[PDB]
Design a protein around this ligand. Structure first.
Ligand SMILES: Cc1cc2nc3c(=O)[nH]c(=O)nc-3n(C[C@H](O)[C@H](O)[C@H](O)COP(=O)(O)OP(=O)(O)OC[C@H]3O[C@@H](n4cnc5c(N)ncnc54)[C@H](O)[C@@H]3O)c2cc1C
Ligand SMILES: Cc1cc2nc3c(=O)[nH]c(=O)nc-3n(C[C@H](O)[C@H](O)[C@H](O)COP(=O)(O)OP(=O)(O)OC[C@H]3O[C@@H](n4cnc5c(N)ncnc54)[C@H](O)[C@@H]3O)c2cc1C
Ligand SMILES: Cc1cc2nc3c(=O)[nH]c(=O)nc-3n(C[C@H](O)[C@H](O)[C@H](O)COP(=O)(O)OP(=O)(O)OC[C@H]3O[C@@H](n4cnc5c(N)ncnc54)[C@H](O)[C@@H]3O)c2cc1C
Ligand SMILES: Cc1cc2nc3c(=O)[nH]c(=O)nc-3n(C[C@H](O)[C@H](O)[C@H](O)COP(=O)(O)OP(=O)(O)OC[C@H]3O[C@@H](n4cnc5c(N)ncnc54)[C@H](O)[C@@H]3O)c2cc1C
Ligand SMILES: O=c1ccn([C@H]2C[C@H](O)[C@@H](COP(=O)(O)O)O2)c(=O)[nH]1
Ligand SMILES: O=c1ccn([C@H]2C[C@H](O)[C@@H](COP(=O)(O)O)O2)c(=O)[nH]1
Ligand SMILES: O=c1ccn([C@H]2C[C@H](O)[C@@H](COP(=O)(O)O)O2)c(=O)[nH]1
Ligand SMILES: O=c1ccn([C@H]2C[C@H](O)[C@@H](COP(=O)(O)O)O2)c(=O)[nH]1
Ligand SMILES: O=c1ccn([C@H]2C[C@H](O)[C@@H](COP(=O)(O)O)O2)c(=O)[nH]1
Lengths: 209, 209, 208, 208
């Protein structure tokens, strides 16, 4: 339910040229053909040689991820993030109407700002929290730096996320697992699906458990 | 109101022995005294050689930091964190009593789970979010993975945190700034105060702005 | 020494990241004047310089010495794939002796060696090179053994990838006058190989 | 046959404490029977292997070749401080000639070179060492130029700091039979320099 766009990626040939550089086997190259694609996959997955995959870089856009899931995504250190800052954007709530009383319309309205999960009760509490947050900002005009303390973890964030193919493999493996938080499994799937189809074969098996 | 402890640190002479290895200046060593300590500060502060500070490691324990602050601390990638997981530890609320009504007694009780800031209205909302979370967990027995979504960012976390001196200088410079969140400025001062007095000269200027 | 930029991230990737933090998309100009200056002004504030990490550059580097390779590999926030001596020394099993040290064998020698501005050093490098050739061809010694007699002037070849924030750091450190000369040359060749459009983010790094 | 010393290490109880911090389960703790096995168990779950990063090791390595240095430098999650050839090469300016090659001078050349399992290679290293010595002593050529004539068997000295998680990776990769012999030697030496109590964390890494 969160939106992931791959905005830029590294042509695969960058990877195969890199691999051939090591053993100087350009003679065996087929000018970016299927044998070159095959090479990235086979060598890229020998552990000692997985650093060749680092030459492939992906620039993503992620919309509608919860702050709670951001906590976990942030722990993958081999990546670059630029994240919508609550310290400077919370005033977005100053302008909206109350979400109380809870009812179908207000619950739909609140989904613009909150990630809902598959429990009605939890979602109701997130809206209650969102409403209190709205009041702090809107009626008492409290600063963002203080008000953010009342914000629920289901609050939506937005980010640019950039990551190389070797780190992306690690991410996909850890977060598509059944031990992983449901939202992180969805993020993993959404990131895979955002990849160009031509690159997806390098990652296809990370999601296999 | 938050506590940082330095559990273990690398002896200073470890860094001096490393500087003297580059240019083989082991001749002018003095068991780590004024000749060796002057060297660490002097050379390590030279950017092309700040690499020498990376040999010093600090193991901290940090108590009473909010999840909000944790989002910011997590973005310092050159460091190691082990964090109390809400996915596994939220059942801690299942035992305790209602925090309603919001009387003076229940406010203090709520402080054990929440970071309070310098605004009474914010804190009151944090406590309301806390009580809804307790209700989800205790009255409805909702699983941690779902309930955490209604958790407020003022919720307290607890972590083990290890960092080398070069990265710690960066962290202290960035988070003692006037532009950093108040809780993070406070963490910066506390990390510094937790350091052995002997080591503090390497970091004092980081705090000067 | 040959440096080529095979691929590079479009500038607007970085400007979209910057605008994401403060949600300032209304004020965008679609990778125009303002978007471009935004990347420069904000990317150079230290607390926001991680914005430049979204820009990635893929390079090919030919003609670098193993000596300078020692120094380039010390930049840890980068990716390299390097021609391996353990596997490619076989290249010497073919060629003809480089003795005597006449101008025809010296020329042939620069195929495999980085020469410096001293004729005597270069001659020593060629002599080390001929003994390496001797171990490989005449005695058929394993690569893993003969490689110990390799001179540090021996040429290497690598794919190198690095992001803008780390490239700023590389170019600053290595264009200094304290840097080995060959590394100063590399810094300059990397800058020169960047798209003209990106160069304004890096040129101050060279200014000492 | 290179010399590896562990100058300082982190107490094991630091990782057991970090591990317990995740689950708030210090209640069952003791760095006793539960703790040491806890570290080994949890550390080896890939999703929780970052608990091992709290353990840090400061080593000194003496007598490693420049050639092996190229490879060791490729492990980027570590800190190294290395004897600079650009400044310390003046060390050769004093010694006598290494020629002619005889049992005595071969022994003297070992002070400066790593020998491998072939006499012919070792002789060529000495030849290159002697030329290097001439450039420096007789021609008074600066280190920055002369280093290009240096053989990769030249010895280096370094301080090396690394955390348990990165060290496991290092030992696994470098103790392979696919690795350069010297690196396999180094992997064994690092393991052996570890305090006995920590070794059970790494011994499996050496087993292929
Ligand atoms: C199911 C699950 C449960 C989790 N539970 C917890 C928890 O309870 N508490 C908690 O604190 N965290 C928890 N985490 C986070 C976890 O500890 C990692 O920080 C996170 O998964 C990122 O993993 P990573 O280090 O492999 O990836 P990255 O940080 O992106 O690192 C990529 C690779 O680089 C290497 N690397 C990066 N930095 C270092 C370093 N400094 N030292 C050595 N090697 C390094 C490692 O090989 C790593 O695999 C959990 C993660 C998952 C998937
Ligand atoms: C006041 C303030 C406001 C902030 N606002 C925002 C915000 O609005 N949005 C947002 O997303 N973030 C924000 N941040 C986070 C900031 O962008 C950094 O991610 C964070 O502070 C960690 O800084 P660091 O990268 O220097 O440290 P670390 O991640 O620990 O890195 C240490 C050093 O290693 C180098 N390094 C590490 N990784 C890389 C890499 N991948 N590429 C190149 N070099 C690397 C850099 O030199 C860095 O200084 C803010 C930080 C501060 C202090
Ligand atoms: C003129 C010159 C002379 C030199 N002489 C010597 C010498 O005699 N001996 C020697 O050993 N080296 C020498 N060096 C190498 C130098 O010490 C660095 O290893 C190298 O320049 C790369 O610098 P860097 O760490 O900043 O870059 P990177 O390794 O790419 O790191 C980028 C940035 O990320 C951060 N970072 C990366 N890793 C860590 C880490 N683990 N901990 C904290 N922060 C980290 C730092 O902020 C760093 O600036 C020399 C370098 C120069 C330019
Ligand atoms: C037998 C053998 C043969 C080799 N042959 C060659 C060769 O022919 N040519 C050549 O160029 N190199 C060669 N190498 C070097 C190899 O490619 C690695 O650069 C080196 O082994 C370091 O491995 P590492 O990246 O896993 O370790 P580290 O650099 O210490 O990294 C530790 C872990 O952190 C993670 N990590 C660190 N940086 C990044 C990054 N930027 N992106 C994603 N993840 C990261 C990875 O998970 C990694 O496992 C060889 C190595 C071995 C062991
Ligand atoms: O190597 C490439 C090729 C294309 N694209 C991007 C540019 C466009 O935004 C998108 C679609 O491009 P085309 O399929 O039209 O080429 O993919 C890349 O990021 N890298
Ligand atoms: O599945 C998990 C569980 C925990 N963590 C990390 C993120 C936080 O820094 C800390 C606690 O996360 P939560 O369990 O509260 O989500 O550990 C993850 O990355 N993934
Ligand atoms: O002062 C700041 C502001 C932002 N961020 C990072 C943390 C989050 O990943 C993201 C948004 O943080 P908040 O503004 O919500 O705190 O940017 C910081 O690290 N420090
Ligand atoms: O200017 C320098 C000097 C040293 N080093 C690093 C590279 C080697 O790992 C080690 C010693 O190299 P040399 O001084 O021999 O070049 O220190 C550099 O990176 N740049
Ligand atoms: O076994 C190897 C082979 C290669 N490399 C890396 C180190 C060098 O940067 C490059 C080529 O090294 P040599 O084959 O020349 O040793 O690849 C290693 O680290 N270990």
């Amino acid at each position: 339910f969160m939106e992931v766009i791959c905005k830029h990626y590294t042509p695969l040939d960058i990877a195969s040229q890199a691999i051939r550089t090591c053993w100087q086997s350009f003679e065996y190259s087929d000018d970016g053909g299927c044998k070159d694609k095959e090479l990235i996959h086979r060598v890229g997955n020998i552990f000692r040689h997985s650093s060749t995959l680092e030459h492939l870089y992906y620039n993503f856009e992620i919309k509608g991820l919860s702050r709670g899931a951001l906590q976990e995504l942030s722990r993958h250190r081999i990546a670059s993030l630029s994240v919508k800052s609550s310290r400077y954007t919370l005033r977005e709530l100053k302008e909206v109407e109350s979400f109380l009383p809870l009812n179908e319309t207000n619950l739909e309205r609140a989904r613009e700002f909150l990630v809902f999960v598959d429990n009605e009760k939890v979602n109701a509490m997130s809206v209650l929290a969102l409403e209190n947050l709205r009041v702090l900002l809107s009626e008492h005009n409290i600063k963002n730096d203080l008000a953010k303390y009342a914000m629920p973890e289901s609050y939506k964030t937005h980010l640019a996320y950039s990551i190389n193919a070797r780190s992306l493999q690690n991410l996909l493996t850890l977060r598509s697992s059944n031990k992983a938080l449901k939202e992180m499994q969805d993020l993993a799937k959404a990131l895979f699906d955002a990849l160009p189809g031509e690159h997806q074969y390098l990652f296809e098996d990370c999601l296999k458990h």
